[PDB]
Amino acid sequence: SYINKPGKTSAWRVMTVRQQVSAVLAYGKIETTLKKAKNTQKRLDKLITLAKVDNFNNRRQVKKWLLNTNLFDVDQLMDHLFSKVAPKYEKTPGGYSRVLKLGPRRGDATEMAILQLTD
Amino acid sequence: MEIRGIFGVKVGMSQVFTTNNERLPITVIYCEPNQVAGVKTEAKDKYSATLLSFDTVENKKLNKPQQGFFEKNNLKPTKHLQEIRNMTGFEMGQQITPQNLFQVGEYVDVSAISKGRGFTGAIKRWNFKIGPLGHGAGYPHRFQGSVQAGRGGASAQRVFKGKKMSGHYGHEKVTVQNLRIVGFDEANMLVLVSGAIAGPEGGVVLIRTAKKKPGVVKPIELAVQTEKAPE
Amino acid sequence: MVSFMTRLNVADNTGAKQVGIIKVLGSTRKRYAFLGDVVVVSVKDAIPSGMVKKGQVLRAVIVRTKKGQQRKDGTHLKFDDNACVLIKEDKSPRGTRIFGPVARELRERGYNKILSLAVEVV
Amino acid sequence: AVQQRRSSKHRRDKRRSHDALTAQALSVCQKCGKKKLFHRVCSCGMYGDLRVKKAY
Amino acid sequence: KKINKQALIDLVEQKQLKAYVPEFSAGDEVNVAIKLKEKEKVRIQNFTGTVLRRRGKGISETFIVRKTTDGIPIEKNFQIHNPNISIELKRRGKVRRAYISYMRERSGKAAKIKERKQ
RNA sequence: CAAGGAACUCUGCAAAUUAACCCCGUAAGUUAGCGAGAAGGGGUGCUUAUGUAAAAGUAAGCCGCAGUGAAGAACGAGGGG
RNA sequence: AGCGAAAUUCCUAGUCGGGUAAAUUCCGUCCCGCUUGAAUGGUGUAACCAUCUCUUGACUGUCUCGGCUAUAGACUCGGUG
RNA sequence: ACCUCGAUGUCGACUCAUCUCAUCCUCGAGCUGAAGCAGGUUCGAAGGGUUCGGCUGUUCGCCGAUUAAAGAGAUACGUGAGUUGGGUUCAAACCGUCGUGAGACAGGUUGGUCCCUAUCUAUUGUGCCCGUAGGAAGAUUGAAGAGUGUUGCUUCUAGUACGAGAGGACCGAAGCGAGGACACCUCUUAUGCUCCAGUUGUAGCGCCAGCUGCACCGCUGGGUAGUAACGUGUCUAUUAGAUAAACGCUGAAAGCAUCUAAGUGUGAAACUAUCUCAAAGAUUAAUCUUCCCAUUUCGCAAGAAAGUAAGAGCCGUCAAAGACGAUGACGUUGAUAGGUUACAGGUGUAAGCAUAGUGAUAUGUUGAGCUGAGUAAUACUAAUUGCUCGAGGACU
C-alpha cells in the first residue's frame, strides 16, 4: 500500500498542541478529544509557570508556542497571558488546568473532554 | 538438601573494583527482614518447607482473610507470602536476614520474573534466521520457517505439538545460577550480588542456595583506594 | 574483530603490504579473531625485496584491531587499524622487527619473542 | 483461502455468542436528577459542585 | 518503606570512590600512570595523551585518552575511580564540545588544541 | 547502524560512492573526427581592503567537526562476443 | 585463403600458460574442425550500446547478523459494508 | 499402469527442521600381524554435534584452508495458499546439424507475467462461560509433561610407563577457549521524529537582534529513559539407581571344566531421577490455612415474600503489564497519572549588557542556559457523594 496520508507526524503533533494551547489561553475553554486534551495540558501548565516572572527572556520562550487566534493576536495574547492569566496563578503549586469528560460524539463515539482554566 | 532462601527487591546495577584487579558488575538487592510465617514438616505433611512473609504493609491495605490469618498467627501484616522447599531449622515467628543465611562470598542462585516483552515474533523469540533481503524477495521477510513435517496420507500432515512460532515473551520466572555474593550492608539492609539479575528494577527477587555448588564459597575482597589529599 | 576475507596491514619488515584473512583458526565457525588470535592468511600486496612472495598461504597473529577489546579492569584498548605479523610454527616472528605498538594479550598466549621485538607494548 | 464446506446456522451463532453488548454504568446527577453515564459531565454542565459548561 | 533507588546505588558507589578525582574537560592532556602488576612489584607505565570524552556519574565514570606512537594513533578508555590508576592533568585546552570525535579523523598540525578554557 | 567490505547471490539485482561552478592535468588506440567531463587532483563560508560598469579574482583576518554547510546535479579501469 | 573447443566441439570440466589460497565461467595458444569456411559472405576494425560475458579500485546492511526509530496499515472503538 | 488429465505445481537454492541406524566425532568393550604414539576390524550406543569458500543452475563433483567430526538415508527425490526463478518447457533471435520445404534437435546461446483477505482441523499465545456440590481470599503437593545435554587446546602428573633408539602414554587434576542457550544494561557500541548545540536557503513575527514554518527529523556533532549486541554475567556440571556390549566371583546339570540354571557383582554421552520451566478441567477435578453466612413470617424445605456478609465486577487514574482481553498499583482514610519543587544524567558557557576590534568576531558576567520519558518529595489538578452481582451447604 502506497500513496498513504502524511499522518500524525511529530511536526503535526507539535502544531496541534500549539493551536489548542493558544486557543485555551485566548478563550478559556476547549472542547476536544480526551487524548488530545491530556497532551495539551502539559504544555499549558508549562507555559503558565514560565510566564510568572514577566521578563523579556520569558516572552521569547513563550513566543515559540503561541499562535494567532480570533479574539487575540500573537502580541495581544502576550499581554493577556502576562498581565491577566498568569498573575492570577502566582502561588498555586501547579495544576492550573482541569480536563473533564463529556459524552461521546454522535459520529465517532470518541470521548470528548473540556479543558478549562481552574480558578 | 539444606536450602536457604531469602526474598528482596532489585534496586539497580552498579560495579565494584576488587583485589586481583577485576572490575565486577554487581546487582543491588534491598532485602527487608523476612518473617517466618509457617513451617511444614516432612512427617506431618509428607514434605518439608518454610514459608516466610515479607514486604510489610499497613493493615488497611490488606484483605480481611489475610489479616485474619496474620492476627491468628500473631505476625506482622505483609502482602507477600511465599515458601521455599527444603528450608528447615527456623522457629516460627523469627526475623531472618541474609547475613545469617549466606556467607561473604558464597555461591547462590537467583530466581526472578523476566521483563515483559509482549507479543514477539519467531526471530526475536527462537533466535531464528531472517530471509534474504535482496536479489528478489517476497512479502514474508521475517519468516518463521516452514512448518511442514509431511504432505500426504502416509506422513504427519500436521504441525507438531510444541512448534516454535510467535507468541508471548517475557514476564516469566527464570533462574540464574552460581552467583557470588559480594557484600552485606547491615545498616541499609542491602545485599550485593555479582552478575545480572532478571526482572525490572523494583521487582521481587528470590535468593537461594545454589544446587550446583551448595557449599562452595569463593573468596572475594574489595580494593581500598590509596589516593591522598592534593599537594 | 577481524573476520573472514578481511584485508589488514603487516607491522613487520617482511615484504607484504596488504594481507587477506582466509580462516579464523582455532575451532569450527569461529566467527571473529580478537587480539592474540592466530589466523591463516594469503599475501596479496608484496615487494620485490621481500622474504615472502605474492600468493603464499601463511600463518599470522593479530596485534592490533580497530574495534578493540575490553580488559578485566575495565580498560578498553582500541587502535586505529587492524595489523598482523607473520609467524612460524614455533610461534616465532618471521620478520626481524615489529613496527608500531602491540597489545598485551600476546603476553598471555606466549609470543614472548613478539613482545621483545616490539617498539612499545600497550 | 476459502471455506471448502459451508458453515451452518449453528456455528455462526456459536461464534456470535461473544458479540453481546454490555450496559454502561450510569449514575444520578446531584443537582437535576437525570441519569448520566458515570464519571462524566451531565447535560447541565454541572459536575459535582462545579459549573463546567453553560446549561444545554 | 519508600525506596529511593538512586540513593542506595550512590551509597554502594561511595564505598569505593576516590578523594581527589582531579577534573579535566574534553580537550585536555593528562598523564595516566598504569600500575601494571607482574609476578612481583609494579611497573608504573605512563599513558600520557589527550582526553576526548568524560562520561558517567559515579563509580562508572570513564574517560577516553588518545595517544600516537610511531604514527599509529591508539585510543584507550579508562575508568576514573579505578584503583592502581593515577591521573595527572598536564595541559588545559579549549574545545567547543564534550565528545571531540574529530580527533580520530584529524591528525598532525590539525590535531593541536589551543590552551586556556572556561 | 559499531568491526569486516561481495565473504551474499545464477549475476555487485538492489542499494551505496561521484555529482554544480572555477583552477591544474589527461594515456593506449584511431578511419585523425574522436577517445575525453578520460584517469587523477585542488578551491568554494563570513568580514575588511584592492579590483571592475558589474564582476570574477587577489591580499589579510575570523568562526565551525564539517562552508555548491539544506534541494537538484556523471561511480571508474581493463579484456572479450 | 582466412579463422578455429567458436552464439558452432559429441567425446570434453580437451592439453598447456595467465588471472585466484582454491577457477565446469574468463583471456592466449595448441588442432582427428564427428559436423568451420568465403555475398544464406570470410577475416579485422576507431567510435557507439537501458546488449551479453569476465577481472578489478572506491563504495556500501547483498552478507557474517541481526538491531533501533517514525509514519500508513494490521490491532481496539463508532458508521457503511 | 491401480489413484489422479471438470489440474497432485515438477530441478536447484533459502528458512525451519523432524525421524531411522546400516555410527563421521564424542562414550564403553572384545580380537589384533596391539611395545609406546597413531592405527585396522567387530560388538554396544541416536543424547548432542556434524565448517567456510573458488568453478558450475546445479544435486553431484574436483580443488583450497580448517575441524573432534565435516556420516548414510527417509519425510510427494520434506518444505512456491512460506521466498527465489538461475535451470527445464511458451511466444522473439542466431550458430552447428537434418529436411527440397514449412519446420526440427536430452545440441549450444541472449531475453522472457510465480495469484489467493484462512472456514474447519493441526500448532504458537491470550481470554470469556461453566464445573470442581456454601461462597470467597491465599499457600501448596505433583499424576501426565516440556527444555538443555556439543567439545577443543595448554600446563601438571611425566620425558614417568614402554622403547637399542627415535618417539612417547592410560588414570587423574588445573587453567583458557569455540559453538549453542538464558538474562541484563555497570562498562563498549547501535538506535534514540515534542532533548541540547552548530548551521544553509526561503517565508513570516512592521525593522536589527532573537525565534517560528518548510526543505529526508533540512543537514551535521553529541545524546536522557527505553529497546538491543558487537558488550558482560551465568549455563553447557556432578551424583545415584536399573542396564546394553563386555568382564566377573562362587558353583552344578555334564565328579573335570564352566559368568548362570539358584545366589552375588562390575559396567556407556543411551534409560529413570538429580538441573530449569509449567502444571488439580489430573471431571480420577487433590491438600492446608484464614475469613463471611448462621433471620422475621407464611408452608414447604438445597420451598416462598421480604432479610441477612467476606469478596468480586462495572467506572476512573495508570504501567513492573499489554494487539484486545487479561496481569499488577491506586481511587481522597490517596502519592496512581499530570502539574510544581529539588536533583541526577545529557548538551556545552544561553539571551541581554559591558569592553576590544573598522567589521566578521573574541573576552567577562558564565560550568551559564536549556532539557521527552529518569530519581524523590508535594493533593495543586484528574482518580465523585455511584451501581450491580454475591451466603445458610442434599443426604448416606
Ligand SMILES: [K+]
Ligand atoms: K492428470
Ligand SMILES: [Mg+2]
Ligand atoms: Mg518537517
Ligand SMILES: [Mg+2]
Ligand atoms: Mg509480486
Ligand SMILES: [Mg+2]
Ligand atoms: Mg520487500
Ligand SMILES: [Mg+2]
Ligand atoms: Mg493410512
Ligand SMILES: [Mg+2]
Ligand atoms: Mg498420517
Ligand SMILES: [Mg+2]
Ligand atoms: Mg438461531
Ligand SMILES: [Mg+2]
Ligand atoms: Mg465475535
Ligand SMILES: [Mg+2]
Ligand atoms: Mg556497518
Ligand SMILES: [Mg+2]
Ligand atoms: Mg570500514
Ligand SMILES: [Mg+2]
Ligand atoms: Mg561468491
Ligand SMILES: [Mg+2]
Ligand atoms: Mg555460497
Ligand SMILES: [Mg+2]
Ligand atoms: Mg544499478
Ligand SMILES: [Mg+2]
Ligand atoms: Mg576508455
Ligand SMILES: [Mg+2]
Ligand atoms: Mg577473438
Ligand SMILES: [Mg+2]
Ligand atoms: Mg583451413
